[PDB]
Amino acid sequence: METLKITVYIVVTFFVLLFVFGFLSGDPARNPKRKDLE
Amino acid sequence: RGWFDILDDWLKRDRFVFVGWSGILLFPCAYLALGGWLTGTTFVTSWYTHGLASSYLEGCNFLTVAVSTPANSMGHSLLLLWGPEAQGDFTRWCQLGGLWTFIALHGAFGLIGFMLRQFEIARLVGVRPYNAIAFSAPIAVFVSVFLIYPLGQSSWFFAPSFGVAAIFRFLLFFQGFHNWTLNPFHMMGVAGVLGGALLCAIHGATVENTLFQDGEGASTFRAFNPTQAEETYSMVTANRFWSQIFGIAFSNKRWLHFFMLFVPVTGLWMSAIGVVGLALNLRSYDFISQEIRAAEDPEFETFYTKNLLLNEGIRAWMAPQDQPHENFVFPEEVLPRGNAL
Amino acid sequence: GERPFSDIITSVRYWVIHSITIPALFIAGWLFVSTGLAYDVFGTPRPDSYYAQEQRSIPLVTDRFEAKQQVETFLEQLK
Amino acid sequence: ANLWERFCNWVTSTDNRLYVGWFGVIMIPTLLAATICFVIAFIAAPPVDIDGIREPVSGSLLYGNNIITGAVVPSSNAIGLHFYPIWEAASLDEWLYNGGPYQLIIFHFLLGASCYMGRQWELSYRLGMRPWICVAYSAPLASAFAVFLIYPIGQGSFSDGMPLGISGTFNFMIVFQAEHNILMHPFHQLGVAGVFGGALFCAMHGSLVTSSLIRETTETESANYGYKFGQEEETYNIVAAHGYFGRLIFQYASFNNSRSLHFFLAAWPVVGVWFAALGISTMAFNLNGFNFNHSVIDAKGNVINTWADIINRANLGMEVMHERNAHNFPLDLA
Amino acid sequence: AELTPEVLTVPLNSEGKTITLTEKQYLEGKRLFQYACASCHVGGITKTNPSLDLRTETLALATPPRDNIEGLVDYMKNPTTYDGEQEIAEVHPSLRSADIFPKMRNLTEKDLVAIAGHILVEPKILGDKWGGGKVYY
Amino acid sequence: NSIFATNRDQESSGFAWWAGNARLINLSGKLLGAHVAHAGLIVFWAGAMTLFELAHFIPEKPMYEQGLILIPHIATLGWGVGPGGEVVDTFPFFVVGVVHLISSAVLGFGGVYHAIRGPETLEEYSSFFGYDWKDKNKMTTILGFHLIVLGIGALLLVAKAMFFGGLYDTWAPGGGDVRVITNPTLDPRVIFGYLLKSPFGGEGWIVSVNNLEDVVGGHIWIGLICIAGGIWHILTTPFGWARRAFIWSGEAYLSYSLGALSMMGFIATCFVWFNNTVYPSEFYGPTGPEASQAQAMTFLIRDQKLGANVGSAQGPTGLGKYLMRSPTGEIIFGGETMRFWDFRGPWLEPLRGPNGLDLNKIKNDIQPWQERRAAEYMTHAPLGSLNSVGGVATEINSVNFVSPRSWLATSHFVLAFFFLVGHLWHAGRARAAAAGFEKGIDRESEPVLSMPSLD
Ligand code: CLA
Ligand code: CLA
Ligand code: CLA
Ligand code: CLA
Ligand code: CLA
Ligand SMILES: CC(C)=CCC/C(C)=C/CC/C(C)=C/CC/C(C)=C/CC/C(C)=C/CC/C(C)=C/CC/C(C)=C/CC/C(C)=C/CC/C(C)=C/CC1=CC(=O)C(C)=C(C)C1=O
Ligand code: HEC
Ligand SMILES: CC1=C(/C=C/C(C)=C/C=C/C(C)=C/C=C/C=C(C)/C=C/C=C(C)/C=C/C2=C(C)CCCC2(C)C)C(C)(C)CCC1
Ligand SMILES: CC1=C(/C=C/C(C)=C/C=C/C(C)=C/C=C/C=C(C)/C=C/C=C(C)/C=C/C2=C(C)CCCC2(C)C)C(C)(C)CCC1
Ligand SMILES: CC1=C(/C=C/C(C)=C/C=C/C(C)=C/C=C/C=C(C)/C=C/C=C(C)/C=C/C2=C(C)CCCC2(C)C)C(C)(C)CCC1
Ligand code: OEX
Ligand SMILES: [Ca+2]
Ligand SMILES: [Cl-]
Known part of the structure; x- marks a missing residue:
């Protein structure tokens, strides 16, 4: 059970970092019109 | 240039309220149906037929007023004002429930008249009569619930009463006596109604959000003209959005709107068919295999057996006041109850 | 072909006419109740006419063709 | 050109057959977890002690259910609102007895469905669309939150969350009516107006457009073939439809602005379901439907029943029978 | 059916003398009962001890009898267990315990008479509904 | 002369009347009036409602039997109540109501003045009070001033608790009493440990706070974090990662706050429903x-x-x-x-x-x-009907009661939900307006037409 718990904690943290750093990576610019929004 | 053709001329004039030949039937019957409900909910009791107050005059509010069904002893009497029961006496007629058959029957012919109006206007304007075809579903619901269902039962008493809380009671009666939520025909109706609400919301939202920028104002409603040839929103951008969000999307505008007709109309028609069965108590009440196993195995329990217990409670606790002509006397000791409650 | 409502209900002639008829109907409906005439037209029990003084039976119609006479009987039993 | 920038371009690419996006990075794993667990549990999970009284209810097909009676059973009333992941159990067998799968399934589902709503915003931005389709979807989403999360929070236990099954849903509805008189609650009444009205307006719009299609086909072929995907011209005569609908009622009850019409179609059901979801979410805190029981009494003080008292009789039969072994004291306070 | 003086005539004491309340005294009692008692005694039962109700027959067999005005007024002043054996003002509202049950403070003797008359008139009107519980709703 | 002579119409602004308050986005003077007059309404309600509550208050009934939600808030702060939450003095309730009601006249005055008499824009009249939504330094500066006001407000609670009578402590020996807090909790492992606590049953995140020492000490930290953050924001300007991450417009700033207020309303809903320390059951039921x-x-x-x-x-x-x-x-x-x-x-x-x-x-x-x-x-x-019949749904009329906790939980869940809808609406609109397509797809440059087919 302790191995399962660590596995899920690591997997959940991985995906949340992707979500956060994805939206930090210049997301307003990722549109098909005005690509300069800072 | 006979009187018939002149009368036809006048009926079909373009006025604020189109009349048509259909109006001869529609307008009196619809007016009398609505007027009877308003008269009855305002002034008329249900004391001699149901043991209930049902009017503003007695102290009811909008949620509890009703025109209630006649007494069980009336059978399926037409209950004409000049009939053998009321014998011309307007006051007795009201006390015996004659306003129920009055609203039911004038409402039915009013509904026929509205559909004929749809055909009549479609024929003059030159459009296909699908609006009227779609309207067969409301009529099927009304005819099966308010007419066919009581005709199969002992009397009009068990039809729905025309009231807000009275219809709520009808819902709960159908759960407890008929186990109507288990009926596959009701389930198909639920899917049609909810799928229609879904379609209505998704199509309206898709159009409003794939609009073309045909104006400069921040209010996009002004950038549309009824006689423009171009579509006001992008079907191509709508198809790519839904194909990528959901996996599939509409690509044919005509199929999309035919499907918006098809889904709720078919659902209401399916529910009408189940209610015809219930007119005969031809219920989807049980699963026989579940009952055989539960009878023999007191540890077998499912959400199915759990719901039967609640129906059994509904029946025993509501029947005496709900069916007063039966004179049910259920001593406390026979009432089914769980622990403590 | 018909005249717009917005001109009718902003016109003086409309308000002259309807400042009379509207209160006359509202007052007449008021007296329909307060004179008690509503109870006798429709047959609705007044608060003291649901039950005789000591009974708790409901006066329920139990016969199709004698229903008129049954209701009259029950009204008589209000002494 | 570096690895992270190529990944960001793939994630947000408008060329993938199914759009992923940053919401999809959360959505895809959680919906997969919820889906696989649900399918396995619906087929093979052993009975669950829903109400905490060592009286397990059978929900799965292998343990004697059909499609209609089967469910994933909510977790035990002994667990309440406690968080019960697999690793908090001494064993899978313990976890199954107490309804663990239900919690794993709904939590992953609610997460995944919230991201589904974000994903609808996100792709609409990548495509140059206007943004508010996700707003329409917030109405069913908030409804799922109400029956799976908010109502348990207000009642103190996930054992009073809606079961994941057909007949379980009916049990939820019946018990809800007994304990809150939801039928007499104006927010459920607005919800009925939304879904009834949405189905009406759905058929109405479908039948009008369909009945004003412009003749582009012979009678031996589907009229659908008279429309080509992407064509610039409108495929039906809206002025003809307005001329019909106006004469059907009166002229000024009929839209002729297509943008007002479709906004009305979006608005009516979305607003009604918002109130349906708010009915469930506020009845979670026991502000219940109207109570007119014994509201009408006569000159002596006899109770004169109305239709509201008949409803109350039915409610009582549900109240006394539900969870028949779970109450020790006279009031079912939660 | 009307609320008549016969209806409003209730036992004054155990000896058998009777008092006749006024229509307004009954309605005042109903209001004070709601204000002070209904939270536990709605409809004639007792939510914190359902074995004891406020039926006239139950009150008749209390010790001392409580099926008359003076017995009820005394109960509201100095409540006892059903067998007379124990005083319970510390857990039941009374003038004697109006310091811990503050809603009793503003009550006067004539208020108690109103509450008592309501408790004795209501089963004459409602029958088994009074003290009957949910079975009779 | 003309009905369309002013800038207060669709023709001048682009916005229809049903979005009329969007016409204010770039009129900082009228916008200031809109805000100040609205602050008057809030203050008005707090004052008039208290006087209503006091006028209808019978002190020997429990508060929760009388439909009160503001007097319980005042009592909780230690005013008007003694041992066991008995009401010993209604005059502090009167004062709170009066002072709020009088002050609402001041706010309404300035609001109406700024809305319909004063400068319509502020940027010519003053470089201080004027602002441009795209000016990130000015925006963080105004944000910094307001952080400071909020920290001072948190510290007023500390001062009342530590130096001006104390707070009502439902946990105090002898059935509960007003008590001065002399040792507020300052250990960050206790204060920030609440923040890292699970929100599920038996833990309850911050709704679990159960003593006044943790409450008081919590507001000492909040007040200091707020004054330090306001100072940071007056003296700094947003870094590049923040600049590249946000939409910088008036509608976007509004949407962020709508999301913030939605979350807070959901938290308050659980606070009042579960917590009996800062919502004493003596007062709230x-x-x-x-x-x-x-x-x-x-x-x-x-x-x-x-x-x-x-x-x-x-x-x-x-x-x-x-x-x-x-x-x-x-x-x-x-x-x-x-x-x-x-x-x-x-x-x-x-x-x-x-x-x-x-x-x-x-x-x-x-x-x-x-x-x-x-x-x-x-x-x-806490069970009752919408028309205030107390008890389960099957109960009969008699008891006129709905718990304050149900009134407070349901109202604030409803508001919190619509404010999340508002967040999604304005957030989506701010993004579409910044990128340039909030009014529809440009027919001649439809982006989907330049994309490869999916199949
Ligand atoms: C115009 C549309 C319309 C329609 C379809 C109806 C229909 C109905 N009404 Mg309603 N009603 C209407 C208008 C209408 N009404 C109006 C305007 C009023 C206000 C006065 C009413 C007031 C009213 C009351 C008070 C009642 C009804 C009732 C009814 C029901 C029974 C009718 C009946 O049995 O008559 C039968 C009569 C006919 C069919 C007449 C046709 C006879 C034809 C013309 C003879 C043909 C003979 C042929 C040409 C030549 C033979 C000659 C020979 C000697 C050689 C039926 C549902 C009853 C009801 O609802 O009970 C619940 C009832 O009590 N109606
Ligand atoms: C809290 C609610 C609130 C507030 C504070 C405002 C504030 C404002 N609105 Mg908005 N608005 C609102 C709700 C509100 N609105 C609602 C509900 C709608 C939909 C109906 C609108 C639709 C709308 C439109 C279409 C427009 C505005 C405009 C405005 C601005 C100018 C108004 C003006 O010049 O009128 C002048 C009005 C008068 C001269 C009549 C009397 C007004 C005074 C203020 C009444 C105050 C009475 C009060 C008791 C006095 C107290 C005095 C006391 C302190 C001594 C102003 C800042 C306008 C704008 O944006 O300008 C660019 C504009 O075009 N609003
Ligand atoms: C935080 C908000 C809030 C809460 C929790 C309460 C709670 C209470 N109030 Mg108070 N009050 C409030 C705000 C609030 N009020 C406001 C804004 C006013 C000024 C009108 C008042 C003025 C007031 C008076 C004069 C009285 C109360 C009373 C009460 C008590 C009885 C309530 C009742 O019976 O309602 C009945 C319930 C309703 C009327 C609800 C109707 C449904 C609403 C309107 C739907 C709202 C929908 C949503 C907001 C809009 C969505 C639009 C959509 C298109 C997006 C209860 C404790 C009474 C009391 O007991 O005093 C001691 C009393 O006499 N209140
Ligand atoms: C908080 C919102 C706010 C803001 C940003 C402004 C800003 C402005 N006002 Mg407005 N105004 C406001 C509220 C506000 N006012 C209120 C509440 C009233 C009613 C009293 C007015 C009535 C008013 C009039 C009649 C005039 C202005 C004017 C001005 C301009 C010059 C003011 C100045 O330099 O004073 C200098 C600074 C001071 C005098 C400092 C005073 C500090 C006060 C007295 C106490 C502060 C303590 C604390 C922070 C207050 C807490 C209150 C809160 C708890 C409710 C400036 C744009 C002038 C203008 O329009 O120029 C053309 C002008 O003639 N205001
Ligand atoms: C209303 C209050 C408020 C607002 C609107 C802002 C707004 C801003 N701050 Mg400021 N700040 C504030 C108060 C505020 N601050 C206070 C009180 C302090 C003192 C601590 C600071 C100290 C501060 C610093 C040191 C910095 C900022 C910065 C900024 C800018 C970047 C924001 C950002 O990226 O957040 C988004 C948050 C993140 C990207 C971090 C990850 C957040 C995680 C994932 C969320 C987890 C929360 C969880 C779900 C729920 C809470 C429980 C949890 C604690 C367990 C933005 C303009 C940055 C800046 O540009 O300064 C000029 C910056 O460097 N602020
Ligand atoms: C392991 C095991 C066994 C698991 C089993 C678990 C289990 C419980 C299974 C349950 C079984 C189950 C499915 C039961 C349901 C049975 C049921 C009640 C069936 C009803 C069947 C029936 C005949 C009903 C009659 C009424 C009827 C026809 C209903 C149809 C409902 C329906 C399909 C509605 C459509 C809803 C829907 C999602 C539409 C999407 C349309 C769409 C892509 C729009 C997008 C879009 C919009 C635009 O606006 C534009 C412009 C474009 C371009 C565009 O694209
Ligand atoms: C709950 C906090 C109560 C309140 C408020 C009222 N009563 Fe009560 N009552 C309660 C209990 C638990 C009991 C039984 C106590 C015991 O151990 O015997 C009672 C009993 C009575 C009786 C006796 C009934 C009998 O059949 O003997 C009477 C007459 C009575 N209570 C009257 C009464 C009045 C008038 C109240 C409002 C002023 C009132 N009670 C409030 C619980 C509670
Ligand atoms: C029966 C009968 C008859 C008939 C009668 C009639 C025809 C009647 C009518 C009647 C009517 C015709 C009535 C009416 C009524 C109405 C009313 C009573 C109304 C009310 C309303 C209201 C109250 C409103 C409200 C509202 C809403 C709804 C929404 C909006 C807002 C408001 C709030 C305004 C005859 C003789 C033939 C024969 C015998 C029998
Ligand atoms: C802008 C605008 C608007 C709004 C406005 C507003 C919002 C305003 C506000 C205002 C306000 C906010 C006001 C206030 C006022 C107040 C006052 C005026 C007060 C007074 C007081 C008094 C007088 C008192 C008295 C007393 C005492 C002292 C004691 C006790 C008793 C008594 C109560 C008697 C609108 C929307 C309309 C529209 C247009 C625009
Ligand atoms: C007073 C008090 C206390 C304390 C408190 C505290 C200390 C608090 C704090 C709090 C806090 C400390 C909070 C925080 C929060 C945070 C947040 C809320 C965040 C958010 C974030 C966001 C929203 C982001 C987003 C994003 C992403 C993720 C990506 C990129 C893009 C963006 C930016 C959008 C206690 C309880 C002890 C007790 C009672 C009293
Ligand atoms: O668990 Mn499911 O259901 Ca809501 O009340 Mn209580 O708990 Mn149970 O009883 Mn009734
Ligand atoms: Ca202009
Ligand atoms: Cl229990």
């Missing part, structure tokens, strides 16, 4: 969990007095009829209220031992005030 535990206690008491051995009475299912074990072993009340064993309250904790409820304490030490308290709370459970 028992919580749902509380009323349910109190029924079990009520009947354990009744039946033990009749001679039942409550510790060994086996219930119909095999679980203890009065007492059972929680999943981790604690002795707890039996029945459906097994779900509510996380409940804690001053009237129940004396019977609690290391293993949970103590059978010896249950047999010997139950005082009459506990019996009284459990009976009162069980009969005032």
